[PDB]
């Protein structure tokens, strides 16, 4: 199967690869088609699922839920991850995209997740983004409430800078279980700004998402050189696809990030998990890396 | 009145709003006019006053002092804040603008403040700026001297980065009481570089100054969009003035900064303190913020 | 002689100025000419020597060694510093310049240093550069091995950011003895990004190298203004040369860096060490600094 990994000190055990339902709507899938899509990725080994507040105009959690309703026994076999803290214009209350990391709202979204997902509990809850107006005390007070009722068992953050992660962390009696961030050849800032070193140092493993199926290639020649490099390295490793070379590039990071998969086909999901068997050489990591950038060192 | 606030763990109690005498000379005010200007802001609730070394070509402290001489009993009713560490070309010894954070000089300026201000003690003393040549041991040795004589009772810094604040802090047996910094829609770097998170994390409240009466609008169309936004939000909050909307924008920061007021009229001072009653919405904070920048998130 | 300085808490005693053999090959020097060059700088007081993995296409250590072979008793009188972690195209295994901070390789290079240098032990070993793929545990495991055999007695790093230095440091039972970095008017980033404050805070002294004999002047008018300023300040201090003014500029940093000298003539080496007697004024430090930049503050 897929390797199992404890995301943090007092944290939970997750599957190295997580299924992300960011684009569940795009898949034009039906409830009985999802219960079977799930089972198939659950059987592959991918048992951790990534959901969020605003994903799909506040529809994805609901959709997933309908399916969880068809096979209620599927919960035990999985670990659910959801988020809150973001306010999109998909709602009329939000004329502008702003953040909301206030107590009641975090409790609100949390409890709304349980309902939409048709579950009595979330394995992990993350503050979607760092809000300039975030008050670590207020958030930490929200977490204490959700935890006190067994509604949420582990807490985390997403897209937090070392400084923000440390701020919120100085207020919680429990260990932030992760910092879900964006990591890939096309987006490597997190590799040098301290974010991944803090994670490795604290032994907290990052859930990594890479806008893959987005098509951020072939239509932005800025990264043609990376396209050409991910292509040759792919043959060298005799991999199934360049996307597979990308998943393995992330897996090599010393922080041991858990790559998030965004696809609607078990076969591509299988191929993604197959990245755990590519023997990428340091030289191949740097060569990929360098082509995305354009220089050495 | 104005809210009272303990600026830091073992720190002093200050008034949420402080009177800043940066432009005391510009006000072409007389000594008896200042003793009465003071009383009036002391009666409004603003009891903490901000002074500095180089302010007014080394004249402002002296001026304030003359006035403190007319009503000696005004001291007890206030808290004095002054600074040192900057060397301006307003003096012939300084052919160039450099920093001086050496022991004797910090003691020198300090003691010179007491004399100019006509007081036996300063409530708080700040290192004006971070000097690349700053030696935390040397400064900390200076602070120990000034404190030992009751001449200075609390120490702080101004415009220090998290790294510099931590460096000096690792040498003092007492807690740095603040990091007086610049915060406003026009200057928001401190909102994302860690500076305010460190403050909130350590529970040290920042004295915030915003070059307001400078006229950094109407003559720099770069911030016309912010001008237009601070204008509409002002009507929405039915505030006295856009300047009042600005003071409230700062007050909303989770770090609870103490806004510094730079004006020479009790009425505008009153209006400034009136910002504690504007009910700014998160959406209104972000909209202001965003107009200054030019993008979301 | 040259001042002696303990580079860190549980660290070794070094000479304020270290001899760097980065360009030993360029000197077209012979083995018996080096044994005598060494003695002469050993007699001047400079007893700490800086070597590295890739320096001179993997030839410099060997060269130095041949000379150490002629006067075996020269070891006791010196302190040897070497590095590893960099992979240059000077080797056919490295088609591209990448980093290698994996266990066996660190042990490999280390042991190869002992052989090339003709010594049973290295006083200090540094990880050449921070590798995005660096695993603090792996490196720390390498250090524990080398130390366990007395082969290496002190460990350090080079060109690490505060975050990287802290990461590796959280894994070692001993104190990183230094962070050898580049410091000079032409390269002052380290003066504001936290690097030198971390060092001063932890009391770890940085080995500083400044590409001096490179001729980064007279052929890059971008720094003519700095050329002109280092020239006048030189007369003011009545120094031997502008290079001497540069060495003293570095020596003034509060972090007390140990300047590394890259020259092949004892006379210039003497002149370098002579920088410990120039009485640079704060004003002269800033004026130099400012000319390199182009603005005040």
């Amino acid at each position: 199967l897929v390797q199992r990994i404890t995301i943090a000190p007092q944290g939970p055990e997750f599957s190295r690869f997580v299924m992300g339902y960011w684009r569940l709507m795009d898949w034009n899938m039906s409830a009985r088609q999802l219960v079977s899509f799930i089972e198939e990725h659950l059987d592959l080994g991918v048992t951790t699922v990534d959901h969020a507040d605003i994903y799909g105009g506040y529809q994805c959690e609901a959709a997933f839920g309908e399916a969880l309703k068809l096979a209620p026994h599927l919960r035990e076999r999985m670990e659910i991850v959801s988020k809150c803290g973001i306010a999109t214009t998909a709602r009329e209350e939000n004329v502008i995209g702003h953040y909301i990391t206030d107590r009641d709202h975090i409790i609100k979204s949390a409890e709304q997740s349980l309902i939409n997902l048709a579950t009595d509990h979330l394995d992990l809850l993350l503050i979607h983004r760092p809000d300039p107006l975030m008050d670590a005390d207020e958030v930490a007070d929200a977490f204490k409430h959700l935890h006190q009722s067994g509604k949420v068992r582990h807490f985390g953050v997403s897209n937090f800078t070392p400084a923000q992660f440390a701020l919120l962390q100085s207020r919680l009696p429990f260990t932030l279980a992760t910092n879900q961030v964006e990591i890939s050849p096309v987006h490597q800032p997190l590799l040098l700004d301290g974010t991944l070193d803090q994670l490795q140092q604290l032994r907290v493993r990052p859930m990594a998402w890479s806008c893959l199926g987005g098509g951020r290639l072939f239509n932005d020649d800025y990264f043609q050189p990376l396209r050409d490099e991910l292509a040759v390295v792919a043959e060298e490793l005799n991999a199934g696809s360049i996307e597979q070379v990308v998943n393995a590039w992330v897996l090599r990071l010393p922080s041991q990030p858990l790559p998030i998969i965004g696809s609607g086909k078990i076969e591509r999901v299988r191929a993604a998990v197959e990245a755990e068997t590519l023997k990428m050489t340091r030289q191949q990591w740097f060569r990929i890396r360098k082509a995305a950038l354009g220089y050495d060192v």
Side-chain angles (χ1 to χ4, degrees), chain A residues 3-292:
Chain A
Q3 312 302 163
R4 299 250 90 207
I5 193 168
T6 302
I7 61 173
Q10 302 289 167
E13 187 195 70
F14 276 9
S15 65
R16 194 92 168 76
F17 284 83
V18 332
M19 259 297 112
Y21 290 81
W22 189 327
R23 305 201 170 186
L24 182 61
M25 298 309 107
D26 293 337
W27 309 338
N28 289 300
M29 205 169 264
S30 77
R32 57 165 289 279
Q33 283 170 158
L34 187 56
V35 181
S36 43
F37 171 67
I38 296 161
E39 221 152 359
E40 291 177 296
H41 75 60
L42 284 174
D43 287 330
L44 272 168
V46 181
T47 73
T48 309
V49 301
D50 189 44
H51 285 277
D53 230 4
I54 64 171
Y55 288 179
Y58 298 103
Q59 281 155 275
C60 294
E61 296 201 307
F64 186 84
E66 288 295 299
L68 217 189
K69 273 212 292 300
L70 292 165
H73 68 308
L74 284 185
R75 188 64 181 77
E76 36 154 51
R77 279 239 285 166
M78 61 176 68
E79 298 102 9
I80 298 181
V81 171
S82 194
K83 323 176 184 75
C84 61
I86 293 183
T88 56
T89 62
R91 280 178 171 177
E92 295 164 48
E93 307 84 283
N94 325 322
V95 186
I96 168 185
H98 59 281
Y99 303 125
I100 312 176
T101 55
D102 304 277
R103 186 176 174 294
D104 291 312
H105 174 276
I106 290 175
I107 290 172
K108 188 182 198 175
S109 315
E111 300 186 323
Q112 256 312 299
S113 292
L114 300 183
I115 279 190
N116 296 308
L117 288 180
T119 311
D120 59 282
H121 77 287
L122 290 172
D123 291 290
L124 174 55
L125 202 218
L126 317 178
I127 300 286
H128 222 317
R129 271 205 163 76
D131 171 49
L133 286 181
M134 189 195 99
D135 175 327
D137 291 292
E138 185 168 45
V139 167
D141 187 284
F143 286 176
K144 268 182 277 298
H145 180 72
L146 296 172
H147 182 57
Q148 226 211 198
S149 51
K151 282 168 165 291
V152 181
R153 32 200 64 192
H154 293 288
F155 301 90
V157 302
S158 186
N159 299 298
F160 270 33
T161 69
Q164 318 183 313
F165 183 113
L167 164 56
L168 178 61
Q169 179 61 282
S170 66
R171 303 281 115 89
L172 299 178
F174 23 63
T175 301
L176 292 169
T178 191
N179 190 11
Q180 175 176 157
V181 297
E182 191 186 333
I183 308 173
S184 72
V186 173
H187 197 72
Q188 319 170 200
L190 271 38
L191 271 49
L192 298 178
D193 77 12
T195 302
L196 297 175
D197 302 331
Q198 181 194 193
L199 295 199
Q200 187 189 326
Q201 180 176 180
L202 298 172
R203 317 280 194 173
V204 182
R205 291 62 196 268
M207 285 171 82
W209 55 277
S210 59
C211 193
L212 244 45
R216 302 241 56 176
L217 293 181
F218 315 99
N219 286 299
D220 171 40
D221 256 7
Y222 182 61
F223 290 122
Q224 198 190 190
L226 171 62
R227 203 226 307 308
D228 297 349
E229 251 290 343
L230 281 173
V232 155
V233 173
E235 283 315 314
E236 289 186 53
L237 300 187
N238 202 298
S241 60
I242 86 179
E243 184 178 306
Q244 198 176 59
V245 181
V246 170
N247 270 301
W249 181 86
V250 172
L251 285 178
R252 179 74 186 63
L253 296 195
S255 52
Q256 299 299 79
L258 317 194
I260 295 165
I261 314 171
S263 77
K265 301 185 305 301
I266 212 65
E267 43 260 356
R268 184 142 78 177
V269 173
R270 181 173 300 129
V273 164
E274 301 288 3
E276 309 173 303
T277 57
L278 294 175
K279 243 64 73 176
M280 202 181 263
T281 64
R282 299 181 68 89
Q283 208 141 164
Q284 290 175 314
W285 188 88
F286 287 103
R287 287 164 44 197
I288 288 174
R289 197 214 77 168
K290 178 178 73 296

